[PDB]
RNA sequence: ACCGAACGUGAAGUUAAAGUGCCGGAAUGCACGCUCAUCAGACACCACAAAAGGUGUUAGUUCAUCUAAAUGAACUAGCCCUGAAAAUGGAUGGCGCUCAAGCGUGCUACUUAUACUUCACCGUGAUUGCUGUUUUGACGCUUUCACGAGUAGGCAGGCGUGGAGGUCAGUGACGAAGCCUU
RNA sequence: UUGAAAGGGAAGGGCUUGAGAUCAGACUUGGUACCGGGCCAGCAUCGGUUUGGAGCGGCAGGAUAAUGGCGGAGGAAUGUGGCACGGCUUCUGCUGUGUGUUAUAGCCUCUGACGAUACUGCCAGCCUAGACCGAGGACUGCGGUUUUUACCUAGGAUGUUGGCAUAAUGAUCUUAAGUCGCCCGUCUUGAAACACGGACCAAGGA
């Protein structure tokens, strides 16, 4: 809910040398329509040599999850900058879409590496579609033939301030 | 929630800061507050730390004169009262009424051995800590660092709770009777129609 | 009956302020048994009396009131905001207030 | 001597704009809009999901 | 507050009235007053103008 | 209110027909600003004072329509950290001509209460009503620069539901300067 | 703008007289009154003149006996306006019906 | 001297920066993780810390060995520990806080400046009209809009004292002037 | 000296209210039992500003949402039934391992025709809860409704009722409580300064 998925499509603006200039296209995690543009010429004006000012965007469109109630693994590329140097690393998250999965990749870099969001390169985000494609321990473990698990430790939330009745915290 | 004429909390269990948070707003806004069983308060953090602590807090007075300095009590309830004054403007006429308005106990004297005690959830140790983290009971620290009644409050209240037990038990088999006693009278014209008033 | 109570229960907590400055128009109550804006706004625009006892007699009663009304909510858990005909003297913080039921709208 | 809001004002809201009464009369804030129902993204578009 | 574009307060700088105390320059002021309001005949308000002016500012002719 | 219906109509028409055809329409580009000056009046360097000034953006909430172009958009570049701006549904415009809409009537602020203030002042570009004023407006008409211009700059109040946490920053990194392009209209439902 | 209403007197000891509607709770228990004669109540019926005249005790005579008629209709509704209101330990108006 | 915002006298609303466990108005609010310290840590300016270490714990990178039940090497960077010694007793502001009331990050509501919005009143500047009704104030009356910080300093309009010309055929021994006085 | 009051390591000040004291005012220069007025309040309706509700409803857009449900085709495993091998259960969820593809569970992919919802926006749509304000003072204007040289919500608050006038009400003084408040003058980049003058009062003093 913090992100949508989009697609931008921009384009050269066209000239005589070159009327009509090739369209591209780019996948962005973004909050809303304005950040996505700013992400697609940021990303453009890496990757190539072009400027806002001498192009136009084509069309940005949301891209809504295929099975949103579909429990899924996702692997996630990303490229990140630290406090000493820039780093590649592959995380995986399980969610029932790439935007639950991109928001808490987001949370986990921030809380591990203390990375903000103006640091991380989103390469590739994907389903993982076999368990054996699922590498990370910390979400194989959710994977195995009939699992369950109690909850230990219960804790009531409370309305009053003051309880006639000792506490429990049984579940 | 609602306006009491005297709140007695149980302070076993509950953890020192969080219950002086509460009650402080509690007598700042006008309610009566005794809090006992003081010496079963806790803190978070292993006993060597808190005891460090309260050595740290040892180590100040006034150097021109030590009757002057900083007064370090020792009782647990002055524990809980240091940390309770530390968040009430005490200096002020409105601060002095409110700690009037607060009683603190070792143990669970008269009048309030015959008297309902209630608890804090927001405050309570075993459901605000991890499971797996350490703690202090106020009463060892304070007999560590130069409190003299251990052993006495100890005697005390295990005869408590034995007159409490039998007083308890008293309760159970009047209320065994009076259960009985309503479920004779079940399936009756009353009782039907109470039923359908979710009574 | 043993109860005749036609008012809630409320407490003069406070006056609206910042941290260092005060402002004695506007007083911060509670009410009783209310722990949310949705439940505090069905009393809003009800009377308020603080009810209070003086040395003299005034028409053979030593019981003097000051009248005020409910105007809007405070904060998240409930408290609301009140506009007494005098300002509410800053000894009865913690004193005890009587939310009217009337004007009544049920 | 005193502003009078149109949008919350009726009377000042028909004498700043005559056309307010008709567009009250003929619904125009929920007119209902006659068309078909078509997909036109039903192929080529549908590289908005995947390349 | 206000980012101003000009000084405030600033007084128009010309004269609106005689500096004088005579009182038939006064008459002829209460005379040309009326029919440079009246009238908008240039002439009538370039009068009215005139008769505020200060001694150097009347060349004798 | 006929040609506004058809125009977004036809634009909603040829953006399916692009579908079909496997072509992607792209919208005219927005001709229209709001600008809402939202930094106080301490503490500016010369170059963005002048062009605050040059743009009747002397308080702080105070908002003017700007016909873009490449003039006017870099001028208000030179203003970025000190304005939000964006682009005014015709809703939006009207709901600011009817409720805090005022003419500069011989350099007084005069309050839009009847259509004769309006035809008084610029019936000679043939408005004769507050309804032609805000086609004029909305549609970057002929006579934009006389209608702007007589129009008093908008004095709007703080949003109800306040601002971002923290303001002095693009929209874009999350605070509340910059472009915001469609999100100027909740802006304003908050503030006017 | 005012109310009209009865105890009635025989029950309550409140008589037809006038209260305003702001002074009110109205609850969801409600009597029958198509079988009432009232159609000579106004505001003119109590301009002002103890000892009450015999028009209003009459007409509190009328009125109880038609008021009685159908309030013996409902089982415990005669006991139930012979009992006056008041708020109870842990009574909450915003959360009660009434 | 930083951030916010610049100030006539008020009512109501909303905010900025900053905050919402108590001191203190506002959540022991919703959420994903990380951290346990026998010198934890805690908010820009700002009230400091380095080279260098750790088999504490977490996440990553690249290689390698394994049914012919996982393991071995090197490394990266987060929080934590060591490196880290001063003189009166003492300072995350204090209390105190450990699935935090700490650190990174997202969200929902909420709190309140002399700032913004609407309205009242004072003043300043401008502005509308006023002679067969101009009426003994036209230096007047009247319509409308905007604005109001200030040392040195400039100017304007007023208040008060001794004495002088004129006037009130003014007050006064039936009490002038002075002095004391919720 | 007398009276009154306050007083835990200064006192004094601002703002606010209470308490006690003082002061004031409309039953008017009231008019002739009535008329009518003054003050303090309750309620109703209106106008201006504003904060709300679990608000209700209509319309539009998008992948003319994506899903889901239903129908059709294809597939595999964290492989259901079946079957076989077992260490333990008197196959008393026994259990584990293999096999293969709906069986005595299901799942995934693609897709066909209908139907919704979420999100965003519009309504000169509707209902509903509170707060503050009432400037002006014959008429004149713009509009509306027209049933009318009429009436209106349309160039700024009226209607009604109760109480009080031996007073409900307002101001000041004293004091309490809450909150804030360093000692002025001066030279100075910078003064509360551990910088200088100043114990107090009158009259004189540039
Ligand atoms: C992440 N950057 C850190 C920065 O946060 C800080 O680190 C402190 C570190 O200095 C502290 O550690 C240091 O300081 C403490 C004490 C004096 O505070 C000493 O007890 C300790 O021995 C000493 N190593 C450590 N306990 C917490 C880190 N966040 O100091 C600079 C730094 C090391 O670069």
Redesign the interface.
């Known amino acids: 809910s913090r992100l949508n998925e989009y697609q931008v499509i921009g384009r050269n603006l066209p000239t005589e040398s070159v009327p009509e200039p090739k369209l591209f296209r780019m996948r962005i995690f973004a909050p809303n329509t304005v950040v996505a543009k700013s992400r697609y010429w940021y990303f453009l004006q890496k990757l190539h040599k072009v400027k806002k000012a001498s192009g136009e965007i084509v069309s940005v469109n949301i891209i809504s999850e295929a099975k949103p109630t579909k429990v899924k693994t996702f692997g996630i590329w990303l490229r990140y900058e630290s406090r000493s140097g820039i780093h590649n690393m592959y995380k995986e998250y399980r969610d029932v879409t790439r935007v639950g999965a991109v928001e808490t990749m987001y949370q986990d870099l921030a809380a591990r590496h203390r990375a903000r969001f103006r640091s991380i390169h989103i390469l590739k985000v994907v389903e993982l579609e076999k368990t054996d494609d699922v590498k990370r321990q910390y979400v194989k473990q959710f994977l195995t033939k009939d699992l369950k698990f109690p909850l230990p430790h219960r804790v009531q939330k409370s309305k009053k301030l003051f309880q006639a009745t000792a506490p429990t915290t049984f579940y | 929630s609602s306006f009491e004429k005297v709140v007695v909390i149980d302070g076993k269990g509950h953890l020192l800061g969080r219950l002086a948070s509460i009650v402080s707003k509690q007598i700042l806004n006008g309610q009566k507050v005794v809090v006992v069983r003081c010496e079963e308060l806790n803190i978070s953090g292993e006993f060597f730390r808190n005891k460090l602590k309260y050595h740290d807090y040892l180590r100040k007075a006034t150097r021109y004169n030590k009757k002057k300095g900083p007064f370090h009590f020792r009782a647990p309830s002055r524990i809980l009262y240091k940390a309770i004054r530390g968040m009430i403007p005490h200096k002020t006429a409105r601060g002095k009424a409110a700690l009037e308005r607060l009683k603190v106990f070792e143990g669970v004297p008269p009048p309030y051995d015959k008297k309902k005690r209630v608890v804090v959830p927001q405050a309570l140790r075993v459901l605000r800590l991890k499971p797996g983290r350490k703690y202090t009971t106020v009463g060892k620290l304070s007999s560590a660092v130069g409190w003299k009644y251990e052993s006495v409050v100890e005697k005390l209240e295990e005869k408590r709770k034995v007159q409490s037990a039998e007083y308890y038990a008293k309760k159970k088999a009047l209320t065994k009777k009076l259960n009985a006693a309503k479920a004779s009278t079940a399936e009756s014209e009353a009782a039907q129609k109470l039923a359908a008033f979710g009574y | 009956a043993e109860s005749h109570r036609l008012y809630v229960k409320g407490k003069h907590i406070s006056y609206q302020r910042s941290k260092s400055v005060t402002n004695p128009n506007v007083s911060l109550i509670q009410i009783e048994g209310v722990a949310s804006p949705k439940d505090a706004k069905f009393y809003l625009g009800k009377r308020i009396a603080y009810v209070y006892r003086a040395p003299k007699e005034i028409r053979g009663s030593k019981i003097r009131v000051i009248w005020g009304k409910v105007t809007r909510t405070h904060g998240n858990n409930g408290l609301v905001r009140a506009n007494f005909k005098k300002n509410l003297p800053p000894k009865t913080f913690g004193a005890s207030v009587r939310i009217m039921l009337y004007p009544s709208n049920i | 001597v005193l502003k009078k809001n149109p949008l919350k004002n009726k009377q000042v809201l028909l004498r700043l704009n005559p056309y307010a009464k008709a567009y009250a009369a003929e619904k125009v804030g929920s007119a209902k809009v006659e068309q078909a129902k078509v997909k036109p993204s039903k192929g080529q578009f549908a590289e908005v999901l995947k390349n | 507050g206000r980012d101003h574009t000009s000084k405030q307060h600033v007084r128009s700088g010309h004269r609106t009235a005689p500096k004088s105390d005579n009182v038939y320059l006064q008459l002829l002021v209460k005379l040309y007053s009326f029919l440079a309001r009246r009238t908008d005949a240039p002439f009538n308000k370039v009068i009215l103008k005139s008769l505020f002016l200060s001694k150097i500012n009347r060349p004798p002719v | 209110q006929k040609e506004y219906t058809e125009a977004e109509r036809s634009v909603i028409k040829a953006k399916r027909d692009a579908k079909a055809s496997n072509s992607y329409y792209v919208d005219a580009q927005p001709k229209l600003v709001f600008v809402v000056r939202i930094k106080g009046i301490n503490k500016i360097p010369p170059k963005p004072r002048k062009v605050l000034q040059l743009l009747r953006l002397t308080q702080i909430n105070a908002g003017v329509f700007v016909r873009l172009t490449k003039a006017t958009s870099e001028l208000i570049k030179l203003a970025e950290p000190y304005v939000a701006y964006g682009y005014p549904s015709l809703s939006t415009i009207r709901q600011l001509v009817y409720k805090r809409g005022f003419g500069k009537v011989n350099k007084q602020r005069i309050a839009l209460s009847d259509n004769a203030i309006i035809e008084a002042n610029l019936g000679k570009f043939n408005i004769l009503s507050i309804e032609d004023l805000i086609h004029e407006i909305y549609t970057v008409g002929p006579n934009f620069k006389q209608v702007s211009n007589f129009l008093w700059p908008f004095k709007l109040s703080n949003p109800n539901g306040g601002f971002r946490a923290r303001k002095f920053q693009h929209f874009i990194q999350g605070g509340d300067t910059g472009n915001r392009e469609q999100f100027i209209n909740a802006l304003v439902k908050q503030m006017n | 703008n005012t109310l009209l209403v009865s105890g009635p007197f025989k029950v309550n000891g409140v008589p037809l007289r006038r209260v305003n509607?702001?002074?009110?709770?109205?609850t969801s228990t409600k009597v029958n009154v198509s079988g009432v004669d009232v159609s000579k109540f106004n505001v003119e019926y109590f301009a002002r003149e103890k000892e009450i005249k015999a028009e209003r005790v009459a007409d509190q005579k009328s009125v109880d006996a038609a008021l009685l008629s159908e309030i013996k209709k409902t089982p415990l509704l005669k006991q139930y306006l012979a009992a006056?209101?008041?708020?109870?330990?842990?009574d909450?108006?915003?959360?009660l019906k009434?």
């Open positions: 509607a702001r002074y009110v709770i109205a006056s209101f008041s708020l109870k330990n842990g909450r108006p915003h959360l009434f």
